[PDB]
Amino acid sequence: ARPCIPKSFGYSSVVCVCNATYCDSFDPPTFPALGTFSRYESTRSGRRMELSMGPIQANHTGTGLLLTLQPEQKFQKVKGFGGAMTDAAALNILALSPPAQNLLLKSYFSEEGIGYNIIRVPMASCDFSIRTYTYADTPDDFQLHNFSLPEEDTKLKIPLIHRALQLAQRPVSLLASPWTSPTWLKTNGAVNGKGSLKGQPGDIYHQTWARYFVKFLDAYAEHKLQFWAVTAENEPSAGLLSGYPFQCLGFTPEHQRDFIARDLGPTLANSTHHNVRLLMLDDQRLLLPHWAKVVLTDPEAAKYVHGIAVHWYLDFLAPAKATLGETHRLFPNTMLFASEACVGSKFWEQSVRLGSWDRGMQYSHSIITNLLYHVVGWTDWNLALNPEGGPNWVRNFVDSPIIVDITKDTFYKQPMFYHLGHFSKFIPEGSQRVGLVASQKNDLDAVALMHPDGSAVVVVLNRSSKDVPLTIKDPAVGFLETISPGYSIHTYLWRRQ
Template identity: 40%
Template sequence: MHLRCVAIVAIVLWVGLSESGTPCNSRRFNHDSVVCVCDENFCDTLDPIEPTARGLLNVYESDRAGKRLEKREVQFGNDLPGPIFWNVNLERTERFQEIIGFGGSWSDAAAIGLDRLSPDLRTKVLRSYYSTEGIEYSTARVVISGCDFSNRPYTYDDVTNDWELNNWSLVEEDVNMKIPQMHEAVRHAGKPIKFMGSSWSPPAWMKNNGELNHGGQLIGNAGSYEWKQYARYLLKFFQAYRAAGIDFWGMTVQNEPMTGWDPWFPWNTCGFNAEMERDFAKLDLGPIMEEGGFAPGNFSIMVLDHNRPLALDWAITVFSDAEASRYVAGLAVHWYFYGTAGPYQVYDNIHTRFPDKFILGTEACNRNEIDGDHIGLGLWYLAEDYAHDILLNLLHWVGGWTDWNLVLDDEGGPNWVGNTHSAPIIVNPGAGEFYKNTQFYAMAHFSKFLPPGSIRIGASPGVEEEGTVELGAFERPDGGTVIIVINSSDMEQYFNLNDADLGVVKVKVDPHAFSTWVYYR
């Protein structure tokens, strides 16, 4: 048995969070684990990560039994009863990718869910995600006009044949919800957030099927007037947000472009293949974004924004073209069908071929598929699925992982086509509370401890793609060392961590637990 290298989840209980923040107000909803409940009077918090005394290691653990980021201190040179299953050696000279960040997404559903909360509860949600007393998200994906997680189908210009875009305008969800909420998130973060935009569909009249859904592609071809006007349609979004005080770090060319070739696809989409995205980027989108003030080096255009089996073809097609490559900074990937989508080593191949291009996870969500209760409050496997995928992505040159909806309501929406799902936070405005679901703490074990600029370093034992025990090691920009362990087995696991300067520390990880270790030399 071998270890798999990376980072993983977190969760909280009334008895948890030893000497760290305020504990979780736990509640069980007929599933195998708990949620943490926040209301007007109480919400669990975390302390900022501070350097430890030399020889001291902080362990943060969450598990199926109910611990949520419970903190304990362990001394190097300790003697812990129990067998040693794993001897872990750090290889600090082996340095891999830099962390870009972790975060969630402002869909209309998320914006509406936040808007329906009281100002105090909304602040608690945003602080839980973006502040140092929360899990310190550093990225956010923002939907450009509508998607399935909207309460209606629409775009920013639904006046037929308005190719000059005279009727283009933001909508209520942008002006009254997303923009104020994003400003508040930035205030709580106290540092820049990497906002990235993604479009699901152009206006229906720009497509050859005349619909937002049911597949369809842009009228015309790369370099045509129609494609240039669609690029200007997208540019207007970034300019409008900039005028409102929100600057974007990047964008994806198209959300899940291969769904646009399915004539039965039920929600907003537009079809591109790799060659079309390559040509759109170099002939239309890239130059027009640059002319509009969003130039390479200051603004990151990403291609694909779809699942792993497509990644290598997309990378070769786009990055091998010098003109397209000048405008395209990286590859955006989604997690769907991660268990059957082929080996994660494809990202190693892409990095080897194109080491100057980053890879970033840009969407993931799941739901309870057991009993039809899609939001699955307290369902542990929802968290384990997140953690495993984040782990394997980070172990194979992916620089971060952005979740889908920041919040959803207690029915898993709104969603205009009924495609309801779970989310890390579920809001219940009628009860005056919201619930931090298990996925929230899965995200926390990465986002809280791995700020942008962290570097993955080598750790042995090596990587097993389908193991029940996984481990990864990182160095923070402030010099801290972070070890993240996933134990999805039914047994306690014992580790000897060997540090060349500090010696050996023995750490126990409980069954079905995520454990993050932090220390400074």
């Protein structure tokens, strides 16, 4: 309903500029009339989910690329899409004027925006915090009598989450992940570095750490927030590494297996939070299928594990088929879920590239590849960062789909925002991935979903410079004649009856 105000910062595409008085907006999603299709188009050139409509033809003739919908070939159901309410994200959002804050929250959580239904919530501090803390820093408090939420939760994160839920028309799923335990539960007595829980699963250290999960869910419940899921630990492989620079807690796959079996599983299951899902791994997919094999071949661990959370940071060294594909094959009833992604974290990556089309394409390519390998959802990292890509107590700066410029009471919606939106806006929870087969080899990335009501949603990404004319065949309905421009992303919607 309100167009993008474009601004170039000298990179491959534009950001859309928002402030207290203006932000670009979309309409709530709707399917067009039977026999018509909708096309939402974003381009490097600067189109931002521009709506065009076309007819569905009874016949098609030609030798060009055909993508044929396989609507009765059913894969995973979709949980959803969203991002992380870090301390850094909360600080950036609340540094804006209240009207600017509302337009940023609407961008993500409104049907005028991209309809996020997932918020990941750190359990106390991570790198994207300005101070180091846990919920239980009083030494040797095994009873956790001194467990409490500081202001980072009560003043920043929780009130922002309430405002997001109020804007959300869809049910929102909260996902909790811890970086570090209290240092007095750790072998190394520090938030960072190589260090695990003292002792072994089944003991006072592991029982106390399990009870910390319940104390956290209790405290959020007192604040009228309920969680869909928790992870067993953020990137447990990190705490196994000498000199690891920020908050971590090391687990081998065997350590995680026994902790889940003996401590975390039984503790959650024997609490009011017994319906909260437990996701294992929450780490790079290079660790699959090995981590899944170690944890899930133990039936006493398996009975507590709902799903396998994956991070994207080693995807470039970890082919999807050998990792996601093999894991699904071995454990088809254990959902795969992408829980953390950002650009700018790598040695060779600039922290923030305002308007980067490449970074948008990174997001959509990842989401498509994940969806094609049974993954049920995809979660961004920081919801918002400053132009340096912070704040961050170890100066570990990265990129975010929204960059806040507090001196101008402004925020910038980057390509990543729109690329994520091409999925989140149009793929409600309960959508199911269906087959989509190419007539010939092509440079496109494409995924088909059946909306809960039986309607079709197809996303087509062209990471090539070349315009690709194509046809989409829906065998029951007809043919969509279209064109995939170089460096474009499209979402197609059509009814099937």
